[PDB]
Design a protein around this ligand. Structure first.
Ligand SMILES: CCCCCCCC/C=C\CCCCCCCC(=O)OC[C@H](O)CO
Ligand SMILES: CCCCCCCC/C=C\CCCCCCCC(=O)OC[C@H](O)CO
Ligand SMILES: O=C1c2ccccc2C(=O)C1c1ccccc1
Length: 381
């Protein structure tokens, strides 16, 4: 692969898109540099026709995977580089969920010493009021809407915790108290909250002492927790997502311990408790999803009958009301010229993107930094 020998060092990249979406025609141009040795791209794109009719984040993937870092156990699998300098044809079908579709065809090749990506894109079936043409996606804000589902979960969790607080304080003060969540003799609410295990989870007093600041009614940790999850769900930084996930894992372990008490130790059926548990599971799942948005995995499999590759993956774009927009990608790559090519075993490219804005750019632009490194190929016994 003399091709891969083309990508030591820092190559100049040019990119040119001509696109038509639901009839609105537009042209994008981008210039930058590529470092296949660190898998790092830096690029600035400007729309040359005026107002871009779609959101910038939906054109990132259409807008040079030959700049990926292929590690040493994987050199025999880098198709993109091994097609150079003749280049390759990359074809994508990008389906947006409950919305339209992009069809793209690009040629990627060396022109002089410049890696050139030339794209024709055609989008159909878009709703002019949907997420795409309505410009309802997020670009890169620090703060954002928590979304309706996160809000339902956290407010319900908080209200239930404040109720359990009130209920604890009342059986403390009258042993004969019953609350709405006490029902006959099957479903119990008060004997649970006022047991050993309803303060500091029944653990603090043995580990830190009864005086501890941490020997609180469980519902105090509850209130703290649901408040936190709301707040962080309003943040869009990577560390916000890390905290969310780790606090959720704590909540999950606490739920399993408390349920092991509820059954098996106290023998009560507490509906408020089980609801708390379901909420914490939902939050944990959303925690997983939030955290997995920092890196996208492009799944590359070989396509021998066409002498190239095919690719599969999903993008989730943050929508301004707190939701997420799915973008299914199907991809084909076929060499332009001849000569041997490298047909890889199944593997993937791990991709991470950072969008930003030149404060000095009057035109409709996108500054894009990108890190891509390959993984997947199993190792040598
Ligand atoms: C502060 C972070 C606190 C994280 C501790 C998790 C608390 C929790 O598990 O939720 C409380 C619930 O009300 C109990 O049933
Ligand atoms: C909060 C997470 C609670 C889960 C902690 C595990 C329960 C536990 O450690 O119980 C051990 C023993 O009862 C005490 O020394
Ligand atoms: O899950 C819970 C549990 C299980 C066994 C023994 C005690 C308890 C609680 O304190 C209770 C709880 C506390 C606050 C909000 C919701 C639920």
């Amino acid at each position: 692969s003399k091709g891969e020998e083309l990508f030591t060092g820092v190559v100049p990249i040019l990119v040119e898109l001509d696109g038509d979406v639901n009839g609105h025609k537009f042209s994008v141009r981008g210039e930058g540099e590529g470092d296949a040795t660190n898998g790092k791209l830096t690029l600035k794109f400007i729309c040359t026709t005026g107002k871009l009719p779609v959101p910038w984040p939906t054109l990132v993937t259409t807008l040079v995977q030959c700049f990926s870092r292929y590690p040493d156990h994987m050199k025999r699998h880098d198709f993109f580089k091994s097609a150079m300098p003749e280049g390759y044809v990359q074809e994508r079908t990008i389906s947006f969920k409950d919305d339209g579709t992009y069809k793209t065809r690009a040629e990627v090749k060396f022109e002089g010493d410049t890696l050139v990506n030339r794209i024709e894109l055609k989008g159909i079936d878009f709703k002019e009021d949907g997420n795409i043409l309505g410009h309802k996606l997020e670009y890169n804000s620090t703060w954002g809407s928590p979304g309706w589902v996160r809000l339902a979960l956290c407010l319900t969790g908080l209200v239930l915790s404040l109720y359990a607080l009130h209920v604890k304080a009342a059986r403390a003060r009258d042993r004969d108290y019953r609350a709405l969540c006490d029902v006959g003799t099957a479903i119990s609410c008060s004997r649970v909250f006022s047991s050993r295990w309803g303060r500091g989870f029944g653990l603090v007093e043995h580990v830190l002492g009864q005086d501890s600041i941490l020997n609180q009614s469980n519902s105090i940790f509850g209130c703290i927790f649901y408040t936190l999850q709301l707040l962080l769900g309003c943040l869009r930084t990577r560390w916000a997502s890390v905290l969310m996930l780790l606090s959720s894992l704590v909540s999950l372990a606490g739920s399993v311990y408390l349920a092991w008490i509820l059954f098996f130790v106290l023998y009560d059926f507490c509906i408020v408790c089980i609801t708390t548990y379901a909420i914490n599971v939902s939050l944990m799942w959303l925690s997983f999803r939030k955290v997995q948005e920092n890196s996208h995995n492009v799944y590359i499999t070989a396509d021998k009958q066409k002498n190239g590759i095919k690719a599969n993956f999903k993008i989730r774009h943050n929508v301004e009301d707190g939701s997420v927009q799915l973008a299914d990608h199907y991809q084909q790559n076929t060499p332009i010229g001849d000569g041997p090519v490298l047909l890889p075993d199944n593997h993937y490219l791990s991709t991470q993107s950072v969008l930003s804005k030149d404060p000095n750019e009057k035109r409709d632009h996108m500054v894009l930094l990108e890190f891509v490194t390959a993984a997947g190929i199993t190792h040598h016994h």
